[PDB]
Curated annotation (Swiss-Prot), chain A:
Family statement drawn from the similarity comment of this UniProt entry: Belongs to the V-ATPase 116 kDa subunit family.
Biological role stated in the UniProt entry: Subunit of the V0 complex of vacuolar(H+)-ATPase (V-ATPase), a multisubunit enzyme composed of a peripheral complex (V1) that hydrolyzes ATP and a membrane integral complex (V0) that translocates protons. V-ATPase is responsible for acidifying and maintaining the pH of intracellular compartments. Is present only in vacuolar V-ATPase complexes; enzymes containing this subunit have a 4-fold higher ratio of proton transport to ATP hydrolysis than complexes containing the Golgi/endosomal isoform and undergo reversible dissociation of V1 and V0 in response to glucose depletion.
Example of a GO MF term: phosphatidylinositol-3,5-bisphosphate binding
Protein name as catalogued: V-type proton ATPase subunit a, vacuolar isoform
GO cellular component, as recorded: fungal-type vacuole; fungal-type vacuole membrane; membrane raft; vacuolar proton-transporting V-type ATPase complex; vacuolar proton-transporting V-type ATPase, V0 domain
Vacuolar face residues: 381-382, 444-491, 551-593, 649-669
The UniProt record lists the keyword NAD: no
Post-translational modification: Glycosylated.
Annotated consequence of substituting residue 650 to S: Reduces ATPase activity
Subcellular location: Vacuole membrane
Outcome after substituting residue 495 to A: Reduces assembly of V-ATPase complexes
UniProtKB/Swiss-Prot annotation, chain B:
Task of the protein: Subunit of the V1 complex of vacuolar(H+)-ATPase (V-ATPase), a multisubunit enzyme composed of a peripheral complex (V1) that hydrolyzes ATP and a membrane integral complex (V0) that translocates protons. V-ATPase is responsible for acidifying and maintaining the pH of intracellular compartments.
Note: Present with 2280 molecules/cell in log phase SD medium.
N-acetylserine: residues carrying this PTM: 1
GN (gene name): VMA10
Location of the protein in the cell: Vacuole membrane
Organism: Saccharomyces cerevisiae (strain ATCC 204508 / S288c) (Baker's yeast)
Family: Belongs to the V-ATPase G subunit family.
Subunit structure: V-ATPase is a heteromultimeric enzyme composed of a peripheral catalytic V1 complex (components A to H) attached to an integral membrane V0 proton pore complex (components: a, c, c', c'', d, e, f and VOA1).
Official protein name in the record: V-type proton ATPase subunit G
UniProtKB/Swiss-Prot annotation, chain C:
Taxonomic classification: Eukaryota, Fungi, Dikarya, Ascomycota, Saccharomycotina
Cellular compartments annotated: Vacuole membrane
Note: Present with 22500 molecules/cell in log phase SD medium.
Disruption phenotype: Increases the ATPase activity of membrane-detached V-ATPase V1. Abolishes growth at pH 7.5 and in the presence of calcium chloride, abrogates growth at pH 5.0.
Subunit structure, as described in the record: V-ATPase is a heteromultimeric enzyme composed of a peripheral catalytic V1 complex (components A to H) attached to an integral membrane V0 proton pore complex (components: a, c, c', c'', d, e, f and VOA1). Interacts with YND1.
Similarity comment: Belongs to the V-ATPase H subunit family.
Protein name: V-type proton ATPase subunit H
Source domain of life: Eukaryota
Job of this protein: Subunit of the V1 complex of vacuolar(H+)-ATPase (V-ATPase), a multisubunit enzyme composed of a peripheral complex (V1) that hydrolyzes ATP and a membrane integral complex (V0) that translocates protons. V-ATPase is responsible for acidifying and maintaining the pH of intracellular compartments. This subunit is essential for activity, but not assembly, of the enzyme complex. This subunit is also required for silencing the ATPase activity of V-ATPase when V1 is detached from V0.
Signal peptide stretch: none
First-to-last residue of the parent protein present: 320 to 478 of 478
């Protein structure tokens, strides 16, 4: 008992009589329904004068602490561990949820406590890292004492020998293990440096040059007893340092591993209140005011169920005061909605990419669901390429459960929603193959034998064919390989393209009548549809009836001349004096009535609508564009033919010189050569053919629907329907 | 009606404001009356002390 | 903290909001118990200290660090004595004992980091190794506080 994709759903503007006290629960649940928007209210004042500023700022601050958790966690060797559970509940959960409440303030305090504690912990950890790095070189030690990179010791010795013009004692020793120097920021090799001098100024110069050479120094003891005592004190402090670093590392890793389990769910939980308060921001809940009053967009067929859910929550929340809602006088234009399922959501979205529907008009998505795949297929043709792309579509259709919860990225991207679009255009490609009779380029011959070329043939004679019958399903396989095949097929599919295009125009234009009739407007009907329809039929549909009559009569047996393939109308453009080769008795004569009707219709179309300042100026442009679009689009329908023939010829040429040379027949070397040739052929066909040409035809039919069909009836642009809800925020926004 | 609902909400808000104003006025009047009563009781206590002094 | 959170709320009642503000002001005025170094001294006289704002007296008022240092680390010796009495009697799982030990450890960490010269007094008292042993305390809060105190002491002594 709900609406469908037939048109825009029945909109509604209901009035939210939200009690002030229960407002947070009401907003939370109402957003949980994933069913309501909120009309933009009290937006006339700047964004930093809202009543919600303090909760917004504290929750955004909280999201910042959560991001800091995620950043340090990614720095550490640990990841999330509870992503699957949280997303499923919040995605399409029922009316029952565990709302937070004061646990929001609990979360805020918890996050602040966690930052103070782990900031202290990180300061302790890097301070003690500096401490152990300092002592590690000091412990390795045991005049001049110091350590420096082992590779630069030679230059240090040279600069020592040169800085003082004489000589000085020197000693060095390589270190056992590299030291992760803070200045170097890497575990570079090091070596001890020892020198000696007499003067104190020489010692100071040694200090200065060692500091310039990034060589740290230590206060060693010349006396053996003093050095031993210093080493003992260093070890005594260092043992406590190892113990404390081990303990603090254990505590940090334990608490991070514990917090990682809930952090992923905590983020998607806390993301709710940001939206909640941004939404109730529009409600205008003044502090002095009580019984909050607000409005939002709902589907009319869901008012009863949303009221029932709100009452159930109020009973669950214990709020004694009842909740009420009333529908306003919807003077303002409500948004357009389409309760599309996964079967047709892709088609609807692709259709509305051009423009959102009018408030209640006949949404163009529904006819496109089928026309777009078939318009593509009549452009695409081949069995084999369509079949491989249908397999590719199945790759996403069958694994829809898995792919839905895995990042689209650049592997699929917009194809994430294209699983069902590609499937339907693929099955229509199957049909077009049955009716063009070409698995890839090569024609198949299951059906009954067509043209019977004469049974006696010379070695290289030119042989015509006999119309012994009509091939039942599709183009006759006998046409393959013949010198007239291109002409026959091209004439055929020109006429097919123009006929199908005219049928598409008629079906799309009838939608304008349906839309106006649903809106119960008559002047627009009589001023646009009937004149426009009679014009478009009286020229182009008259051409269509011309061509169908032209096939219908067996011309040569009929005896009277057969007009050219696409001749009669352009011959008629001259004058009512039909030149020659009449289609039927008075068929080329009576059509002057249609022509005069159209030419006397054009000024009526020009004047009827304005006759209720710039309305006439708009309507004259409207008539001009109507006629020009009509002619241009009816011509544009040749694009189906164009890419059908392009695909057929490309398939032919690739097949003739990328596969099946049959070289080295019955030879193992020939087997290898044909294996490589087939691999290259399949790679070329897949990549080039399906990707390039299939998406090309996709785009051509897509534009076809966007203008040729849509613009005939779809004019109104309305507001989109974006209700208040979201599934999860596990995308790790930064 | 929508206008009727808005008018009803406005009337409810006005009634709530009137109740709050009546509460504030009652608070002020009670404070003044209790101050007067305390003054009277203190005058009675002073008169009792004066009577005790006269008896003494 | 609950009063502060209520102050952060936006209850739609002028009387209720005024009452919340008055309660918050009263709590803030009562928070003078922290600034009273006499209150900290009294808690020291008590065998068990409580996690009161006095436990943040040093951080909120570093002035008491001088009094703690005075009389040759008198307050530091008193705190070390309290910790040694708690440890030597064990009972680290006792809730009251655990709270007292945690408060003493936090205060000692605040004091020692406020004056590194007290590290020598702590070491002479045996508290330098006592806190290290206490780092393996059963209680998570006790162990964490001991780790913080040891990191403060080790970090200050490393200079």
């Amino acid at each position: 008992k709900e609406e469908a994709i037939f048109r825009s759903a029945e909109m509604a503007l209901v009035q939210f009589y939200i009690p002030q006290e229960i407002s947070r629960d009401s907003a939370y649940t109402l957003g949980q329904l994933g069913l309501v928007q909120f009309r933009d209210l009290n937006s006339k004042v700047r964004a930093f004068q809202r009543t919600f500023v303090n909760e917004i700022r504290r929750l955004d601050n909280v999201e910042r602490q959560y991001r800091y958790f995620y950043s340090l966690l990614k720095k550490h060797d640990i990841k999330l561990y509870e992503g699957d559970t949280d997303k499923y509940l919040d995605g399409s959960g029922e009316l029952y949820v565990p709302p937070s409440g004061s646990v929001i303030d609990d979360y805020v305090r918890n996050a602040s406590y966690l930052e103070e504690r782990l900031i202290q912990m990180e300061d302790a950890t890097d301070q003690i890292e500096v401490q152990k790095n300092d002592l590690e070189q000091y412990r390795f030690i045991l005049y001049v004492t110091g350590v420096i990179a082992r590779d630069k010791v030679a230059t240090l010795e040279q600069i020592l020998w040169r800085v003082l013009r004489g000589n000085l004692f020197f000693k060095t020793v390589e270190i056992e293990q590299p030291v992760y120097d803070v200045k170097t920021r890497e575990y570079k090799h090091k070596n001890a440096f020892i020198v000696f001098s007499h003067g104190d100024l020489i010692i100071k110069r040694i200090r200065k040059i060692a500091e310039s050479l990034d060589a740290n120094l230590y206060d060693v003891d010349s006396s053996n007893e003093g050095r031993s005592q210093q080493l003992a004190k260093v070890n005594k402090n260092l043992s406590d340092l190892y113990t404390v670093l081990k303990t603090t590392s254990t505590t940090l890793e334990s608490e991070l591993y514990a917090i990682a389990k809930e952090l992923d769910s905590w983020f998607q939980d806390v993301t709710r209140e940001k939206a909640i308060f941004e939404i109730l921001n529009k409600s205008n809940y003044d502090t002095n005011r009580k019984i909050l009053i607000a409005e939002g967009w709902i589907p009319r067929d869901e008012l009863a169920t949303l009221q029932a859910r709100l009452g159930e929550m109020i009973a669950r929340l214990g709020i004694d005061v009842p909740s009420i809602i009333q529908v306003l006088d919807t003077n303002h234009t409500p948004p357009t909605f389409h309760r599309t399922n996964k079967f047709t959501a892709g088609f609807q979205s692709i259709c509305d990419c051009y423009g959102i529907a009018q408030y209640r008009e006949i949404n163009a998505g529904l006819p496109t669901i089928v026309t777009f795949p078939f318009m593509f297929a009549i452009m695409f043709g081949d069995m084999g390429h369509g079949f491989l792309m249908t397999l590719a579509a199945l790759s996403l259709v069958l694994n829809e459960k898995k792919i839905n919860k895995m990042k689209r990225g650049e592997i699929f991207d917009m194809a994430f929603t294209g699983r069902y679009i590609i499937l339907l255009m693929g099955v229509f490609s199957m049909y077009t193959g049955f009716l063009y009779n070409d698995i890839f380029s090569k024609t198949m011959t299951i059906f009954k034998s067509g043209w019977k070329w004469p049974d006696h043939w010379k070695k290289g004679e030119s042989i015509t064919a006999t119309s012994v019958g009509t091939y039942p399903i599709g183009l006759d396989w006998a046409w393959h390989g013949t010198e007239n095949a291109l002409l026959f097929s091209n004439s055929y599919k020109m006429k097919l393209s123009i006929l199908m295009g005219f049928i598409h125009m008629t079906y799309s234009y009838f939608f304008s009548l349906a839309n106006h009739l649903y809106f119960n407007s008559m002047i627009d009907i009589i001023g646009n549809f009937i004149p426009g329809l009679l014009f478009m039929q009286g020229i182009f549909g008259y051409l269509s009836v011309c061509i169908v009559y032209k096939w219908a009569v067996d011309w040569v047996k009929d005896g009277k001349p057969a007009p050219g393939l696409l001749n009669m109308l352009i011959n008629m453009f001259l004058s009512p004096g039909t030149i020659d080769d009449e289609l039927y008795p008075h068929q080329a004569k009576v059509q002057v009535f249609l022509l005069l009707m159209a030419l006397v219709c054009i000024p009526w179309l020009l004047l009827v609508k304005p006759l209720h300042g710039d309305i006439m100026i708009h309507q004259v442009i409207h008539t001009i564009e109507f006629c020009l679009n009509c002619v241009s689009h009816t011509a544009s329908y040749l694009r189906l033919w164009a890419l059908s023939l392009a695909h057929a010829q490309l398939s032919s040429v690739l097949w003739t010189m990328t596969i099946q040379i049959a070289f080295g027949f019955r030879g193992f070397v020939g087997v290898f050569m044909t294996v490589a040739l087939f691999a290259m052929w399949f790679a070329l066909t897949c990549a080039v053919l399906v990707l390039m040409e299939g998406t090309s035809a996709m785009l051509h039919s897509l534009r076809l629907h966007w203008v040729e069909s849509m613009s005939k009836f779809f004019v109104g642009e309305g507001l989109p329907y974006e209700p208040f809800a979201f599934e999860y925020k596990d995308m790790e926004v930064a | 009606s929508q206008k009727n609902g808005i008018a009803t909400l406005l009337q409810a808000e006005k009634e709530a404001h009137e109740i709050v104003s009546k509460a504030r006025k009652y608070r002020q009047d009670k404070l003044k009356q209790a101050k007067t009563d305390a003054a009277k009781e203190i005058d009675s206590y002073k008169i009792q002390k004066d009577k005790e002094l006269k008896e003494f | 903290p609950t009063v502060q959170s209520l102050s952060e709320r936006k209850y739609s009642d002028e009387e209720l909001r005024q009452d919340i503000s008055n309660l918050k002001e009263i709590l803030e005025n009562e928070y003078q118990e922290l600034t009273s170094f006499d209150e900290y001294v009294a808690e020291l006289d008590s065998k068990l200290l409580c996690w009161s704002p006095p436990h943040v007296d040093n951080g909120f008022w570093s002035d008491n660090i001088d009094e703690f240092k005075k009389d040759n680390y008198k307050i530091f010796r008193q705190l070390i004595e309290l910790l040694q009495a708690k440890v030597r009697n064990g009972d680290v799982n006792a809730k009251q004992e655990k709270i007292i030990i945690q408060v003493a450890l936090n205060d000692i960490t605040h004091v020692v980091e406020l004056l590194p010269e007290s590290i020598d007094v702590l070491d002479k008292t045996g508290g330098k190794a006592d806190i290290m042993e206490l780092l393996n305390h059963s209680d998570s809060r006790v162990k964490y506080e001991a780790l913080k105190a040891t990191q403060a002491i080790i970090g200050y002594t490393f200079k």
